[PDB]
Amino acid sequence: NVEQIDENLAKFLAERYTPESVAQLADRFHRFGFVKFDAANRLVPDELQTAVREECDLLIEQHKERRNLLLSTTGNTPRRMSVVKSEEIEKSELISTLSRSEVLLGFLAGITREEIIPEVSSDERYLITHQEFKSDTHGWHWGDYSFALNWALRMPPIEHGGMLQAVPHTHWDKSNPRINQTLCEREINTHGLESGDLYLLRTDTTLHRTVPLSEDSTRTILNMTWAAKRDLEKDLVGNDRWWENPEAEAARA
Amino acid sequence: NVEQIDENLAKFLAERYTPESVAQLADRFHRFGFVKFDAANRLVPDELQTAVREECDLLIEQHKERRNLLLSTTGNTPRRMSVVKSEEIEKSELISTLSRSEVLLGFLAGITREEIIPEVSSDERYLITHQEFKSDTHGWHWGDYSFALNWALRMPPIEHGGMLQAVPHTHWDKSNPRINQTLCEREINTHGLESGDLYLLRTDTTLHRTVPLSEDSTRTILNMTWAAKRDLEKDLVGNDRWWENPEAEA
Amino acid sequence: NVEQIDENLAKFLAERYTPESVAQLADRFHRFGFVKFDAANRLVPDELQTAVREECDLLIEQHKERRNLLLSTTGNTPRRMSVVKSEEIEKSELISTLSRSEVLLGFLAGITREEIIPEVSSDERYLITHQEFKSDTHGWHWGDYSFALNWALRMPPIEHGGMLQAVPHTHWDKSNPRINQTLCEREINTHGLESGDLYLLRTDTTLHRTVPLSEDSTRTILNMTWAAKRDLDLVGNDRWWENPEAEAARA
Amino acid sequence: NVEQIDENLAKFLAERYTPESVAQLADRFHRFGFVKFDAANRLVPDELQTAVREECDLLIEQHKERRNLLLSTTGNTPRRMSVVKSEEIEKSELISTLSRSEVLLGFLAGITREEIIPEVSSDERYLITHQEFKSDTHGWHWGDYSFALNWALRMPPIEHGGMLQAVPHTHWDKSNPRINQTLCEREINTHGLESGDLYLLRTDTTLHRTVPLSEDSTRTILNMTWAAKRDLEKDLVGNDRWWENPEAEAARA
Numbered sequence A, D: 001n002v003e004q005i006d007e008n009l010a011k012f013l014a015e016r017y018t019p020e021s022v023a024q025l026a027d028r029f030h031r032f033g034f035v036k037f038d039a040a041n042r043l044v045p046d047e048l049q050t051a052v053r054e055e056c057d058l059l060i061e062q063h064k065e066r067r068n069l070l071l072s073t074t075g076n077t078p079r080r081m082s083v084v085k086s087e088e089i090e091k092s093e094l095i096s097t098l099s100r101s102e103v104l105l106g107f108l109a110g111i112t113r114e115e116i117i118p119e120v121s122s123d124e125r126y127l128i129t130h131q132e133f134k135s136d137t138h139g140w141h142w143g144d145y146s147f148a149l150n151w152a153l154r155m156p157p158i159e160h161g162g163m164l165q166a167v168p169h170t171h172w173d174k175s176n177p178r179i180n181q182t183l184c185e186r187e188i189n190t191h192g193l194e195s196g197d198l199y200l201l202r203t204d205t206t207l208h209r210t211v212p213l214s215e216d217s218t219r220t221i222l223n224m225t226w227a228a229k230r231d232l233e234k235d236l237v238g239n240d241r242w243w244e245n246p247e248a249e250a251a252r253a
Numbered sequence B: 001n002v003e004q005i006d007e008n009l010a011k012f013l014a015e016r017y018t019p020e021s022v023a024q025l026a027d028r029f030h031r032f033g034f035v036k037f038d039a040a041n042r043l044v045p046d047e048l049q050t051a052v053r054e055e056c057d058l059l060i061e062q063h064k065e066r067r068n069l070l071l072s073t074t075g076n077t078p079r080r081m082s083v084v085k086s087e088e089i090e091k092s093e094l095i096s097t098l099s100r101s102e103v104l105l106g107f108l109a110g111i112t113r114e115e116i117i118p119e120v121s122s123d124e125r126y127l128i129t130h131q132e133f134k135s136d137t138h139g140w141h142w143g144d145y146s147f148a149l150n151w152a153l154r155m156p157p158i159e160h161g162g163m164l165q166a167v168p169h170t171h172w173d174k175s176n177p178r179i180n181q182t183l184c185e186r187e188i189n190t191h192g193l194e195s196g197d198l199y200l201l202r203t204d205t206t207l208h209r210t211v212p213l214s215e216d217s218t219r220t221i222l223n224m225t226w227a228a229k230r231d232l233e234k235d236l237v238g239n240d241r242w243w244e245n246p247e248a249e250a
Numbered sequence C: 001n002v003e004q005i006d007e008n009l010a011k012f013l014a015e016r017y018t019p020e021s022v023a024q025l026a027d028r029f030h031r032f033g034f035v036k037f038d039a040a041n042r043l044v045p046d047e048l049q050t051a052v053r054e055e056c057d058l059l060i061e062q063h064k065e066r067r068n069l070l071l072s073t074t075g076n077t078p079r080r081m082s083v084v085k086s087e088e089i090e091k092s093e094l095i096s097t098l099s100r101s102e103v104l105l106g107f108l109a110g111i112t113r114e115e116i117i118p119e120v121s122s123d124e125r126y127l128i129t130h131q132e133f134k135s136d137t138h139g140w141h142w143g144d145y146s147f148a149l150n151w152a153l154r155m156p157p158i159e160h161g162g163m164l165q166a167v168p169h170t171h172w173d174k175s176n177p178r179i180n181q182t183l184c185e186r187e188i189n190t191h192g193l194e195s196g197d198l199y200l201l202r203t204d205t206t207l208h209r210t211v212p213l214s215e216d217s218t219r220t221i222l223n224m225t226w227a228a229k230r231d232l233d234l235v236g237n238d239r240w241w242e243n244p245e246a247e248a249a250r251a
């Protein structure tokens, strides 16, 4: 562990990725607000991901918090899932140091074409969403920050739902979200995911959701949220931090 | 109401549409499988639509039937709504005669670029879908026939759902629908509707659904399904006629 | 030759296509007005294509006719190439019999989802275009008939131009083409082609052109034009390939 | 003139734009790399544009230089036009102060969602392209800098060509442009322009060109090239500055 994680990851990335291949991924990240790291574009060693998935499975069994609400700041889109707060995930030494790894952040900076600053709100650095029932979903929303590295730790079959639908090049107006109006004006990109996949999401300008589960399954994702230069010194508004506080102002039943 | 509907509709369409403007609509029908007749592109007189809605409102109050199921031939997509069967709507002399009007079918033939044939199954000539509860939806599906003229008689606010999402240039494999896999590989066109709107839908090659209602509202449409030349002599399979039979095998 | 072509092509296609995978090509054909037949999806055996190309190279060396005009029926788009008339290509029994093959038409009918009828005008059944100079191009245009199977016999590198740009879901108004206005309203699909490729084109409802050659190269195609039930009244006086002095042809 | 330009433009823009409507223009500028200021979305008063045009028409009649070459850094795409160099346009007092106007840059910063810095190379600050012959065109290319405010001063009829064809979400590789391979992979957006139009262009990540003139006409633009935070401290490369030096290293006739 320790610095060997950064050293092994730096070797793990130098075997598959070049500046030219990263520049092609950067063009896709701007066009879609989304790039996927699957079997043909792996991001972390399989042993490292297994250690992260085992850490998340332990945090879930210890700190599972069921959520079933609607967020008024996002057009009353539902939040039907179980979550693990950011303060509980920070206690994991593996997830915390990896989220601030100068190797992982520096490499992904070539895809975002801008600095990836790990300075966000202490209640939003990390988030684990655990969907396991029918109609569980992460409704249409944006992100308060610019970037998010989501770990598709557990993915149900595609025929069972759970895909990530996205609409890039949008914005979040918490007083007038216009989610259904944006769908009428813009085409929706549906991104299928499999267990083990990772993907970078430009969360501030991509209206995105997860297709609700069509039956009882299991959908687990670890969220690593990072801020850009535009997110610094900005005031957090909305009173809609539903994951940390289930009784937030914007959180309705 | 009498045989003067065709004479008035022919004048109604001649006042608004030319062969060149219809050709522009025919291009939009092939690219999206969908052409909307909204406030700026009316299809029928408002007094004719009012008489159609009043006939449908009476059919709903007399013959509405709740449906709550999933269709295995469409990837187990839900069908949560109330329906009025085709044999009941056929009793309406206004709806039945208008659905075979040589003026209406001859005009829409310029958009479909082929003959519109009013010779479909007797259980699918007409259909009224009436949603009014939260999560009510017409799930992802295709149509056994090519064409369908849908009357957006009543639509909730856009913020309450009920929009039509469509994926053109697809096909229906009842043994392997591949609905969620098609979504991952194809962009979804969401089409907002308003009360009074009408739209022509290429139902056989456009995967379409209605966005579920986010809360209790009211969503009423009338479906006039017609056949193309490709649909004649074709045998119906799937055992999935859920609207006519709520216990349809599929 | 003989009837062994249809027997060989039927076994060739039966080993590469299922009704389900053909239905996937039908969706792409209605969506893009274009379906390419490259190495991943071959259409004819390499021996059949070689005999066809050799016949086309002979027809070019014997009856090549240079064209350099503008067609007013398509917004004065240029036509700079060499052509071979359908009446000369129809002399080749191979190209003629293959164009009416029930196995070939029956298979491609599963992509168009409608009958492919080989009953078109006698001056438009076949066409060979041979571009070899800089700025040679087949300008923006439509087709008077619905279908066309183009044989990308010889293609220059993509850096020398020659790609097929297409805009599907359009129509041809010979009195008001509105090509540049259509380009401003729609996206352009550029389809790269390599030597040996084939592709089906929905010519009546797809505005298409070939990118002009950026330098002296060699671009050769063989056009196999068919008709649907829609095409069973030719107007415009713009048949430039058969008549270089058409009323719509300018300079 | 003088300081009255900023006070008149502030008002002109305060009556035709809201923060909510500029955000809608920001979404379009990110999705297409291009946003047009036409009759329904004017940017400058008609009296200011008339003075800007009259200045450019004088700079053309005095310092126009013909160009007819191919740029090897952009796949040998042609440059058939007449140009006025940046140092000559810099002599105009009106164009110089307007390009650095804190009101114009501040308003357009809401569309780019990032600071617009008027600190670019002294040979690429401004540029006027003047096409008037058949086959004249500004071939497929990218921009060394991020932003460019282009003034469609005189546009021929659309049937005579001259539209702006763009492909957003790309990047410039001077050693391997892959212009024709990018077109085969991406859809082209054609943007028709009329005389009097203005448009913002994300020049660094949008592969764009001008459709060649189908006949002898007149096509005149004014380029106001600006930089972002990413363009600062970056070394210029390629030796392909054809507009300033017709005999550049990457310039071939």
Ligand SMILES: N[C@@H](CCCC[NH3+])C(=O)O
Pocket (backbone or CB within 6 Å): A071, A074, A124, A126, A127, A140, A141, A142, A143, A144, A223, A225, A240, A243
């Ligand atoms: N803001 C999103 C969730 C982001 C939290 C994860 N960092 C929502 O309200 O649904």
Ligand SMILES: N[C@@H](CCCC[NH3+])C(=O)O
Pocket (backbone or CB within 6 Å): B071, B074, B124, B127, B138, B141, B142, B143, B144, B148, B223, B225, B243
């Ligand atoms: N195929 C439709 C039913 C058609 C009835 C209306 N023409 C469905 O699965 O919902």
Ligand SMILES: N[C@@H](CCCC[NH3+])C(=O)O
Pocket (backbone or CB within 6 Å): C071, C074, C079, C124, C127, C141, C142, C143, C144, C148, C223, C225, C241
């Ligand atoms: N109509 C086409 C020519 C067709 C040649 C035979 N398929 C044109 O305008 O160029």
Ligand SMILES: N[C@@H](CCCC[NH3+])C(=O)O
Pocket (backbone or CB within 6 Å): D071, D074, D124, D126, D127, D138, D141, D142, D143, D144, D148, D223, D225, D243
């Ligand atoms: N890079 C451009 C020139 C830009 C000049 C000022 N924007 C070209 O190759 O034509």
Ligand SMILES: [Cl-]
Pocket (backbone or CB within 6 Å): A142, A143, A144, A148, A203
């Ligand atoms: Cl987010």
Ligand SMILES: [Cl-]
Pocket (backbone or CB within 6 Å): B141, B142, B143, B144, B148, B203
């Ligand atoms: Cl249907």
Ligand SMILES: [Cl-]
Pocket (backbone or CB within 6 Å): C142, C143, C144, C148, C203
């Ligand atoms: Cl053609």
Ligand SMILES: [V+3]
Pocket (backbone or CB within 6 Å): C141, C142, C143, C203, C208
């Ligand atoms: V053609």
